[PDB]
Design a protein around this ligand. Structure first.
Ligand SMILES: *[C@@H](CC(=O)OCC)[C@H](C[C@@H]1CCNC1=O)NC(=O)[C@H](Cc1ccccc1)NC(=O)[C@H](COC(C)(C)C)NC(=O)OCc1ccccc1
Ligand SMILES: *[C@@H](CC(=O)OCC)[C@H](C[C@@H]1CCNC1=O)NC(=O)[C@H](Cc1ccccc1)NC(=O)[C@H](COC(C)(C)C)NC(=O)OCc1ccccc1
Lengths: 181, 181
């Protein structure tokens, strides 16, 4: 939990930004090069507001699996010269389970706030907002609107991105190494 | 920062609650016996909602110093049989400065969220919402409405209660040992 939070904070400082799409305000983790990730329901258009500045979106990939099932992630390539710090070494090849994770959020509504979510379990299939969705990671903590995009982390690992929630159960889309390339 | 967050979380689990007064929703640290603390501007009436339940307020002390200057703390004695875990050993005799503090919040709006605020400096006098106020602790982080009552902590220490903020500067009222008794 403690080394989780230390990792979480250093990672948010180096690789996250606050983004606005027409569909709301999100935390955004940049991954490597000009590629970042948002929840799919962030629905990025041709331009987004990153740290209050218009940034053109050169490409958005809505991620689905081999059967077209929603993974609730949108990869985006940014029209910007600054490259993100390569963090793909922190993404696992498959869905991570951990005893101690922190969820990290960084928006106008939740400015640099961290939640100790505890154990993260590979939940897998979840019908989320009426959309059958896979590779879900689940954690218990009281979820809230505005926390999507939050970055789920433990010591040495970026597990995924917060995309949904009901009640006191939160859900991240696993953020997997091979999504990058 | 890491051992700060571990301490913060264990302390919030053992001694904090979510409170509603007519003036809003607050984090509330219980200190010992039936005595807890709220920001003064929480303005507790004869009854409050603690963890969604009506609790009678048997006594509220608005704290001022020897010259009547606002300290922005209200001590309250709760009409309840459960005694708080005695935490006065975690309160200092004078205002604490630290290199690494976490601010801990626990309301419907910010449910179990933690902010790494960094260095806490004894700020002292501050005109806050038009009220000359003393024993202020200052930390840099983007403050928000709804975070009052938040508990400012480092490893082994409860420094104070969040009571105000402007811009990217936050302020706690130092929570001092001798306020208790
Ligand atoms: C993040 C987005 C946001 O706030 O909008 C603009 C900034 C938001 C966070 C959740 C809200 C409350 N708890 C949260 O963590 N994400 C969403 O609202 C999701 C949006 C979405 C994702 C994928 C497809 C379609 C929409 N939607 C949900 O989380 C959705 C909301 O339902 C209620 C009940 C919470 C209002 N949850 C959902 O469909 O859960 C199904 C479920 C989950 C677990 C057990 C049973 C059922
Ligand atoms: C907590 C209470 C709340 O949200 O209400 C019901 C739930 C709230 C938290 C601040 C809001 C934005 N930043 C915060 O951390 N606390 C307050 O609003 C304080 C209430 C109060 C305390 C003591 C006496 C009277 C009222 N008030 C402030 O923090 C006040 C708000 O001013 C603005 C500019 C932020 C809107 N701040 C203030 O007066 O600051 C003076 C100052 C501070 C530092 C440098 C220059 C000036």
């Amino acid at each position: 939990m403690g080394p989780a939070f230390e990792f979480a904070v250093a990672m948010m400082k180096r690789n996250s930004s606050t983004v606005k799409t027409e569909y709301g305000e999100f935390t955004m983790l940049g991954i490597y090069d000009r590629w970042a990730v948002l929840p799919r329901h962030a629905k990025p258009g041709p331009t987004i507001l990153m740290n209050d500045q218009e940034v053109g979106v050169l490409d958005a990939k809505e991620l689905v699996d081999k059967d077209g099932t929603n993974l609730e992630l949108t990869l985006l390539k940014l029209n910007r010269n600054e490259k993100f710090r390569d963090i793909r070494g922190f993404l696992a090849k498959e869905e991570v389970e951990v005893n101690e994770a922190v969820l990290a959020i960084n928006t106008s509504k939740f400015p640099n706030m961290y939640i100790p979510v505890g154990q993260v379990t590979e939940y897998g299939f979840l019908n989320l907002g009426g959309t059958p969705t896979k590779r879900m990671l689940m954690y218990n903590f009281p979820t809230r609107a505005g926390q999507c995009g939050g970055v789920l982390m433990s010591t040495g690992k970026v597990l995924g991105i917060h995309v949904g929630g009901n009640g006191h159960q939160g859900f991240s889309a696993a953020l997997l190494k091979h999504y990058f390339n």
